[PDB]
Amino acid sequence: SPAKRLLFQMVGNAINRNTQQLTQDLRAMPNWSLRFVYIVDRNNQDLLKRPLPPGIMVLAPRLTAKHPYDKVQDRNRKLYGRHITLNDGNSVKVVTISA
Ligand SMILES: [Cl-]
């Protein structure tokens, strides 16, 4: 639920940003908080090219233009996810992970 509030604030920021700007503001976040957020592009790559922890790729395929939001329990963790399209036209999936 901290994870859900992180998704919320992140999506709130990201929707007004382009790919390059969202990449740099993701990079500018502190390391301890990055372990909880991934932003996955149309190539199923994290915007900082980090390897995706398992579970991210159970949730990501579900996140769609028609059904943008979903939550999953995986490996004693809640993952929360949201598909958005940036002002670029590029689509990304912001995914956050708990404790
Ligand atoms: Cl959108």
Pairing of strands 37-40, 78-85: unpaired
- From the centroid of its chain, how far is CA 95? 3
Residue 93, phi-psi category: left (phi > 0), alpha (psi -120 to 50), beta (remainder):
beta
Q: How far is the CA of 51 from the centre of ligand 1 (A)?
A: 25
Q: How far is the CA of 52 from the centre of ligand 1 (A)?
A: 23
Q: What is the DSSP string of the chain?
A: -HHHHHHHHHHHHHTT--HHHHHHHHHTS-HHHHTTEEEE-TTS-BTT-PPPPTTHHHHGGG--SSS-EEEEE-SS-EEEEEEEE-TTS-EEEEEEE--
Q: Tokens representing 66?
A: 């028609």
Q: How far is the CA of 72 from the centre of ligand 1 (A)?
A: 21
What resolution does the deposited structure have, in angstroms? 2.6
Sorted by where each starts, the structural domains of the chain and their CATH numbers stand as 1-99 (3.30.450.160)
Long-range residue pairs from 12-18, CB within 8 A, at least 24 positions apart, any chain: 14/39, 14/84, 14/86, 14/92, 14/94, 15/84, 15/86, 15/87, 16/87, 17/86, 17/87, 18/86, 18/87, 18/88, 18/90
Q: How far is the CA of 36 from the centre of ligand 1 (A)?
A: 22
